[PDB]
Design a protein around this nucleic acid. Structure first.
Ligand SMILES: [Ca+2]
Ligand SMILES: [Ca+2]
Ligand code: NA
Ligand code: NA
Ligand code: NA
Lengths: 247, 241
DNA sequence: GCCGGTTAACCGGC
DNA sequence: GCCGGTTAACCGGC
């Protein structure tokens, strides 16, 4: 991680920060800090895409523009769709998109850190948030394996806890954790919640002992196993209880 | 519907409205049907304010006088017990955006806003599972003449520094053919449609609707389970040993 | 403690 | 046309 060496600082600077009154905008402050302290490495996802295509003005159409990624897995995680990519121009730049994978990209020497900020109202009853689609993650692992891209990118999370203090939201603490250091078989896949893996960053175990390739194979075994169990569970929860009204 | 008879009134007032870059719907209804119209949390406040002698969640839950509406409208037990004139519910995940109620009959209204300049993407309408439980509850308690669940689509496009409403649509969930309802399991098990596309040709009774919906729901759940193997298990087996 | 369902719409494959 | 996956976190049952 490129963030990890300055996380202590980040943690200190963010605590006490405020945003007018839900905590979503704290992500903008995370970005501001990173832009100030790692200016050359830091991008919004759409910003990285805009920069990539701006540097290659002669490369037009979605196919050629896709070739600029030089990585199947990164293309998968970061690109916009074919029409969006084809219609891109300096006058028609990418702006934020609701379901972009990452909030913030940090890249250096062609290694990629995908950072997702998780904001959390710390006064409400704890509810683990959507982290990332378990299915997007499965596809990522399969593509990592097919292409032997095991040392190219990390997926990392920064939790920003906040509380309502008068007119303002204030940050009270933060946490940092790396997806690829968690034990894959311990990740919670909430199928109803858009097939999303869910955890609090603060709680994520970080003791995985294997290679990235091993992480990928292991998560895939986990994913496949959970999907099988869910297929069965749906009869239990969505079929059985209601059959008495229709038979 | 209490809204349907005045839809033309609403469509006209809205069809040129602009917000800065559309709960103008609530405003209009509140001004033209003030005795009937509530935000959900507002209806609950009103209900509990009008019954000051009733405290705690069990007793306040009895104020609904209907298990099904209890299930659709109420907040959780602790929230309800902790409610007071000085601790009022605020807007919230709530089933409905707007409630219109008259003579012990309830219209649940959900407003769907839509950026009409982008590729059409049918929005989450309501949980197929919440709907399933609701039908189940309607049947168990024979509450077939109590409420409707209705939708109002408001289409808009960006124009300058503002969003402009260019059209609207209105449709009643309980007039749609249940078996035509698209359940998108990945998207939080939500029914999905555009209001303007919703068929309104169901001819049977409310009870028939509920039974037909349940058969549909159960059938679609079974299909989803099966399709999970094909999409989430099969394509990944080759990587595991 | 443990568990998982719900709201807001929203992009883009073939 | 037809089809369905993803982001934002968030609430309250035993
Ligand atoms: Ca985020
Ligand atoms: Ca709505
Ligand atoms: Na994001
Ligand atoms: Na995410
Ligand atoms: Na809804």
């Amino acid at each position: 991680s490129f963030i990890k060496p300055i996380y202590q600082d980040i943690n200190s600077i963010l605590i006490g920060q405020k945003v007018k009154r839900a905590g979503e905008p704290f992500e903008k402050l995370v970005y501001k800090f990173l832009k100030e302290n790692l200016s050359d490495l830091t991008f919004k996802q759409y910003e990285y895409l805009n920069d990539l295509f701006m540097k290659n003005p002669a490369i037009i159409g979605h196919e050629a523009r896709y070739k600029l990624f030089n990585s199947p897995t990164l293309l998968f995680l970061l690109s916009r769709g074919k029409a969006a990519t084809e219609n891109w121009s300096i006058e028609n730049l990418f702006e934020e998109k609701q379901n972009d994978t990452a909030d913030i990209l940090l890249v250096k020497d062609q290694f990629y850190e995908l950072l997702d900020v998780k904001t959390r109202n710390i006064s409400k009853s704890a509810f683990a948030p959507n982290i990332i689609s378990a299915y997007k993650l499965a596809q990522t692992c399969a593509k990592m394996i097919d292409n032997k891209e095991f040392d190219l990118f990390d997926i990392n999370y920064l939790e920003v806890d906040w509380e309502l203090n008068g007119e303002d939201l204030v940050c009270v603490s933060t946490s940092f954790a790396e997806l690829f250091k968690s034990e894959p078989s311990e990740l919670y896949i909430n199928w109803a919640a858009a097939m999303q893996i869910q955890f609090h960053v603060r709680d994520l175990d970080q003791g995985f002992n294997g290679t990235r390739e091993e992480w990928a194979k292991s998560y895939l075994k986990h994913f496949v196993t959970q999907a099988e169990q869910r297929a069965i569970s749906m009869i239990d929860k969505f079929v059985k209880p209601f059959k008495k009204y229709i038979l």
